[PDB]
Amino acid sequence: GHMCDAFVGTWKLVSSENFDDYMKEVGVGFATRKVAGMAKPNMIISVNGDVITIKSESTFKNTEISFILGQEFDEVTADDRKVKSTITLDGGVLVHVQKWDGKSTTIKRKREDDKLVVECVMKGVTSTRVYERA
Ligand SMILES: O=C(O)C(F)(F)C(F)(F)C(F)(F)C(F)(F)C(F)(F)C(F)(F)C(F)(F)F
Ligand SMILES: O=C(O)C(F)(F)C(F)(F)C(F)(F)C(F)(F)C(F)(F)C(F)(F)C(F)(F)F
């Protein structure tokens, strides 16, 4: 169970680019966009056998997803979309696709330098969020 060894630990947000535009394209409502943009989340990534957990903690809301690489699962996103999610390990990157309502979005969680970078894409709109170790 070593696929995710470069991701495990705790992380805190450094910077965010185009995040509100990404959320707009996804369809997130105004108030959720404003709370999300204001959060300084702490991310916890952990491995228990085959099951990986990604937890995001912020002042007003936490999320927690647990999954096996390659196995589709149900996710209720923070903006309350009911999506079908699959996360795979491709070239050292966690590639997460969410499918719902005839639409898709991809969240790539990757390593760059000493950082964990989250790249979100919806119909050509890309957000880049950089985390440092907590
Ligand atoms: O509208 C809500 O219910 C909310 F709580 F404001 C929220 F925006 F969804 C949120 F969950 F807090 C959040 F900000 F989106 C978040 F916590 F999920 C996040 F985006 F900050 C993180 F990065 F933690 F996921
Ligand atoms: O920083 C991250 O870990 C993240 F993955 F980029 C994310 F911010 F959590 C997010 F997935 F983009 C997101 F915030 F959850 C969201 F934008 F997708 C959303 F729409 F679910 C919400 F509602 F939280 F904004």
Numbering used by the authors: -2 to 131
Task: Give the article text.
Notably, PFOA was found to bind in two distinct sites within FABP4. First, the PFOA-bound structure reveals two binding sites that accommodate the shorter-chain PFAS. At the “primary site”, the carboxylate group is stabilized through hydrogen bonding with Arg 126 and Tyr 128, as well as a water-mediated hydrogen bond with Arg 106. The residues, Ala75, Thr29, Ala33, and Phe16 primarily interact through their hydrocarbon groups, contributing to hydrophobic interactions. PFOA binding at an observed ‘secondary site’ is stabilized by hydrogen bonding between its carboxylate group and Thr29. Since the X-ray electron density is less intense for the PFOA in the secondary site, we expect that binding is weaker here than for the primary site. We note here that the assay likely reports only on the affinity of PFOA for binding to the primary site, due to the positioning of ANS here. In the PFDA structure, however, the extended fluorinated chain allows closer interactions with residues, Ala75, Asp76, Thr29, Ala33, and Phe16, reducing the distance between these residues and the ligand by approximately 1 Å compared to PFOA. Both PFOA and PFDA induce an “open” conformation of Phe57, which results in a larger hydrophobic cavity, compared to the closed conformation of Phe57 in the apo structure. Interestingly, this residue is implicated in access of lipids to the hydrophobic cavity. ,, The open conformation of Phe57 is necessary to accommodate the secondary PFOA ligand and the terminal fluoromethyl of PFDA. We note that a similar conformational change is observed with PFOA but is induced by the presence of a second ligand.
Here, we show that human adipocyte fatty acid-binding protein 4 (FABP4) can bind a diverse array of PFAS, including next-generation replacements for legacy chemicals and longer-chain perfluorocarboxylic acids. It transports fatty acids in adipocytes, − macrophages, − and endothelial cells ,, and was recently shown to regulate beta-cell function via the Fabkin hormone complex, influencing insulin secretion and metabolic homeostasis. We determined crystal structures of FABP4 bound to perfluorooctanoic acid (PFOA), perfluorodecanoic acid (PFDA), and perfluorohexadecanoic acid (PFHxDA), revealing three distinct binding modes. The crystal structures of PFOA, PFDA, and PFHxDA bound to FABP4 illustrate three distinct binding modes that underscore the protein’s adaptability to varying PFAS chain lengths.
